[PDB]
Symmetry: D2
Subunit: 381 residues, 4 copies
């Protein structure tokens, strides 16, 4: 009684959509290394043998797109035609133009940096939950860690049949507690991972349980009733872009909260700080996690929204799930007194000209590595 | 006291991402017209002068991609280089391969149709709210209608300076009422729309208020405090793919609930019914709207999830926001007794081999035109 | 005294331009297998990881371009990323539209087949020389045979370090004899061939002399003065499209007479019989070889030309180098009495709807395998 | 008696192949403006809505390919979707990598500039004929001038129905005179030119005769027997890349001697001086024209050939058609005493690092504007 299921997924570094996110952010970082004020909107598309870059960049940097793309693919692990994709020999196509001058004049031309307009309209959410120390849902934390474990065991050679393309999915049974949520047990785990031709299904399923799941998921969460769907398709030799086209910004729930919270629809990768889809979502995460680590909430959702060309957010909303003694109105007032959500101030607070974006583009943007948006702000009230 | 803001956005038919969604679904419909069992996973990318199709199709149809793409762009209204894009003269590139045989064998090969596996893993949500007759959030309903009004006034020649690329955003002030939400007033409206070189800002802003906003939004919602951001960038001559690259599946919140509810991350357009991202999200909407129209809830969120190759959902969850006398456990039991969420049963219930998908690919997939997922199921309990 | 040098080159099946010619003709043959009246103008471009098809096809055939392209690349031998290109994993992009209706109406619409117009304007030459039995210049015959020998030794595994991309060049010293030419000796041979990383230059140069040159070139032509440039660049590991972009119709002298004779500029591959660039050049070869095998000339050049939409050639010219007792005017009259050079008659005489074109697209179109244009017509005069 | 026909063609600036040549050379010039030692091998492909650049460039220049391509297309005149192509709105795709290091090390790395190796193997020809002052065949001179006249009348607005895509073809009746050739009369003229929808065939044919042919071709060459094929297809509204795919290096006979002389197969455009296809063909033209203007020959063909990595030509041959009192052996000795045909010396003599290449890429590379290869060298003997 009072229990429910919730499911989240994650994907690996070689999932084709995630390849695109990583490449887009490799391009962004390459520009930022030379020009901290680069305007970047780089979409990547991946299909058999092809990486296409399409979008808009205005920058003083000189970037060798061939080299940057190929290095990103190399890092992921696609280095031979036997794996379905090879950084050495794939096609790299570039369709990158300047930023529209109409956008530039309306957003940033001649504006004081603190008073730059949002680079687009849109809405964004931040979320935090005290169910884990890092203030993330357990479902997606576990899903990410399963993909990370696959990559680890691939790279260290202990499961050399593994390839870079993987997906995981975790269903947890929760109890609720005055609006907060309490994990009880893992109900179902899915793992699918690309593999070499020679390994059999039974060898894979045994390894996935023993060397992946048991290594990652605490035994206290696994019991006789847990359902395992390990290599449920039965065969996954074809993978990466050869198996499924990839695009930037097609894993936005994997990138964020795994179905928990909410999403405003904007993708992160390939975008500089003036694109509030990224900067304001990072800031909203920072606000949410500041409220939870500050002891004001156990769980909270923050919405913000913007108009192109306008600095200040159009709206800010706080939803605390009943997990605060303060009203949502009071929390909103605390937020407004402690945060300035103009993009030209977020950039300073969160150090958003620094070329660290490729590191964000797999395993989620939140809940790890003490990025600036993960370090709570101390609140005055 | 008790009030909050919420913001949602929509985009027009000529927004570059939406162009891609429409093209992807034009391709799907073209295949389904000849082969109801076509397996389609068609991604579209749009940039200056270019439509690229990339993905996987296994079908008995013979489809003229050149023709289908160009006709979709023609419908949208991009028919001259003065508008930034022309169906007659753009490049159409095709990188479409067969569906992976490894996927096919794991999903649908040799399986009874009712027992086809999900075409992928993933999670999906359905949502319904009694705040409007069509059981959609007012914020996004209004946002969509503003874009539809722009297209209407473009097509009828009364505002001939309009071009197809538009975005809108609506912030509503709400009151809550026992978990349900009650719209009070429109707080802020944003409209940005591509325009010809000759029309001035003041002419546009006057028209957008008088002929667009007032035509769509009830006066009772607009007052002296409402904020209007009309052509806030000041100039939007460059637009469509020339101004911003488009991709399929980059408007998934516009396609669904505008930030309300939740999203599992999967895109709809370009996918046949075996891709549960679409079919199970449609079914989840159908469940949610059935619960609200059936009088069981005022507002409800439904989660479902799947594993590739497995027919039955892995999990089902119901969240009623406190708006039912029945427990969430009781509602879940009603759902399980009344719905079969296998993809090979959803296809029959929702008629998902019918080539009506292009019609879904602008102005949201939900809350309009009495598609099968909008017709409540009568529940037995 | 009276001697001169002449040089011709050839390239192998994996030279990037020749890859394109072969793919274009694989596409043509695929169409002709289903629709003998297909209108085909298929250009191919090759670069790292990419085959692009661009051009115009109007056909009743259903052709799987992915499959046809990949099979052609497989035949050539590019089957692994270690070789720089892999048919399994490369990108195939398609930008093929219908034939222009304006062309169609002016060329073939509603016209009796014998009276179809030329598909374009242009000029074409045929050439024949009695210096070899097959009526080809010795320089290019030898150059082709050197590339064929490389491919043979690659395919049979005796030189497993060889890759498909090769070039050869042969300089012969000739004497003249009343307008005819008499080979004396080979002055210089060049061979460059892509190779694996592990083989050293000395091993390659020894093999190229002993196993390639000596196997192909009669010893009577090689002496102490012959110059050998074997792997003259010193290193050729990177090759195929990765080393150099390829295009259809960039080897038109290799395809024909090696610098001897003349050329009107039109490419052969990827074109159906209505494109007189191919059909009329084949017919001109047939005329030239008929004059030499008929005993009228020892050496002869034939020019023809056409206007788009017009059936009969605009001009015909015969140049016999002084090697006939008959005047050029008399030979022209014999040609006109014995040949009908309308494209809709050439197609019947030379069987040009038959899908044998891929076989023409390496090692020259002339002087081998008794194609119809190589079988002399018996002349009446 | 003693007369014969000869035909040559030319194409206009907007013919799709010529568009590609011009773009390739615009790219070369852009690089040379910043880096005189740029290594450039830029192929261009054009089809509906698309310019693709593919090839190899190693340069210190920073070139904005978008801008350079679009400016070249603008110059040609494709500036509106009504014309079938628009520089403002077409797709520009870039697939340009570095020059292969294996090539670089074998050709130019660490070599004294005069002693740089040829950038490839190949053969090249130069030709000159005293039949015109500029030492070019009359057939192609006239063909070029007809296309130039079309462009002139398009640009000055007197025939505003003209579009940039055109082709011409001229057949001249000649007499021979001791190996030299003497034009007598124009036998046939073809002109095809893209046109707007509204102009009728009779208006076009009248204009083409009166305003184009009569303006260009001396009346003494036109008589009652001359055949005119003016707009012979009847309709040519669709044109440019939309009507026919273009590629660099598909007009190599138009670029040179119109079927006269010979050709070694290599294309000119998009290549720096180390590519002997261009530099040695220019030098061979210079030699030929020096022999004719020096009074040694009336007509002459020069062959040269190279091996990759080797500076000096492998072979040189002179054919004087019987038009000199000196033997061909004597002429060869004069050539060898007066010319150094190493590429690293040709570059100095012919100023081949200067960014003048786009000017060569329509209307032929020879016989006009007193380029260095058109200024005879004064010979010592
Ligand atoms: C199954 S595919 C999406 C549907 C696909 N585009 C189609 O044509 O049916 C989505 C992801 O699943 C994974 N995948 C690919 N092949 C698979 C297989 N044989 N078994 C399981 N998962 C697979 C990869 O991570 C891929 O990016
Ligand atoms: C502003 S753009 C996204 C950022 C962009 N890629 C860049 O390079 O900065 C997103 C959408 O805004 C709209 N847009 C384009 N140009 C605009 C302008 N000048 N003013 C307002 N909105 C514009 C179009 O709907 C476009 O698809
Ligand atoms: C040398 S490349 C043409 C020039 C080249 N595009 C560049 O960037 O310098 C022409 C042909 O030579 C051959 N080739 C490629 N790399 C070579 C090498 N390292 N040594 C010799 N020949 C090579 C291949 O057959 C190739 O298609
Ligand atoms: C006729 S096309 C080549 C054949 C063509 N690729 C096909 O699909 O049949 C070659 C050139 O002829 C010219 N051309 C195009 N359309 C034409 C027409 N309707 N009439 C005459 N010439 C035309 C253009 O200069 C074009 O580049
Ligand atoms: K968000
Ligand atoms: K996909
Ligand atoms: K969803
Ligand atoms: K974008
Ligand atoms: K020819
Ligand atoms: K090349
Ligand atoms: K030449
Ligand atoms: K063509
Ligand atoms: Mg995806
Ligand atoms: Mg957005
Ligand atoms: Mg977008
Ligand atoms: Mg998904
Ligand atoms: Mg080439
Ligand atoms: Mg031609
Ligand atoms: Mg051509
Ligand atoms: Mg060559």
């Amino acid at each position: 009684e009072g229990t429910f299921l919730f499911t989240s997924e994650s994907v690996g570094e070689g999932h084709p959509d995630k390849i695109c996110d990583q490449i887009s952010d490799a391009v962004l970082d390459a520009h930022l290394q030379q020009d901290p004020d680069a305007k970047v909107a780089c979409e990547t598309v991946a299909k058999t043998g092809m990486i296409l870059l399409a979008g808009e960049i205005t920058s003083r940097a000189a970037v060798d797109y061939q080299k940057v793309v190929r290095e990103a693919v190399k890092h992921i692990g696609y280095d031979d035609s036997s794996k379905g994709f090879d950084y050495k020999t794939c096609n790299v196509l570039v369709a990158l133009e300047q930023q529209s001058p109409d956008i530039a004049q309306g957003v940033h031309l001649d504006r004081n940096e603190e008073d730059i307009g949002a680079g687009d309209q849109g809405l964004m959410f931040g979320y935090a939950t005290d169910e884990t120390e890092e203030c993330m849902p357990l479902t997606i934390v576990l899903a990410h860690k399963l993909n990370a474990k696959l990559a680890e065991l691939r790279r260290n050679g202990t499961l050399p049949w593994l390839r870079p393309d993987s997906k995981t999915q975790v269903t947890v049974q929760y109890m609720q507690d005055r609006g907060a949520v309490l994990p009880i047990r893992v109900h179902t785990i899915v793992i699918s991972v690309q593999h070499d031709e020679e390994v059999c299904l039974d060898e894979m399923r045994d390894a996935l349980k023993e060397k992946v799941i048991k290594a990652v998921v605490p035994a206290k969460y696994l019991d006789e009733d847990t359902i395992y769907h390990l290599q449920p398709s039965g065969r996954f030799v074809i993978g990466g872009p050869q198996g499924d086209a990839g695009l930037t910004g097609r894993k936005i729930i994997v990138d964020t909260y795994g179905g928990w919270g909410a999403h405003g629809g904007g993708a992160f990768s390939g975008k500089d700080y003036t694109k509030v889809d990224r900067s304001a979502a990072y800031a909203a995460r920072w606000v949410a996690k500041s409220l939870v680590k500050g002891g004001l909430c156990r769980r909270v959702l923050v919405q913000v929204s913007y108009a192109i060309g306008v600095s200040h957010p159009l709206s800010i909303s706080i939803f605390h799930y009943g997990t605060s003694q303060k009203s949502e109105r009071e929390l909103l007032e605390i937020v407004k007194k402690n945060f300035d959500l103009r993009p030209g101030v977020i950039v300073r607070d969160l150090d958003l000209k620094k070329p660290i974006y490729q590191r964000t583009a797999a395993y989620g943007h939140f809940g790890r590595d003490s990025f600036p948006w993960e370090v709570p702000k101390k609140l005055k009230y």
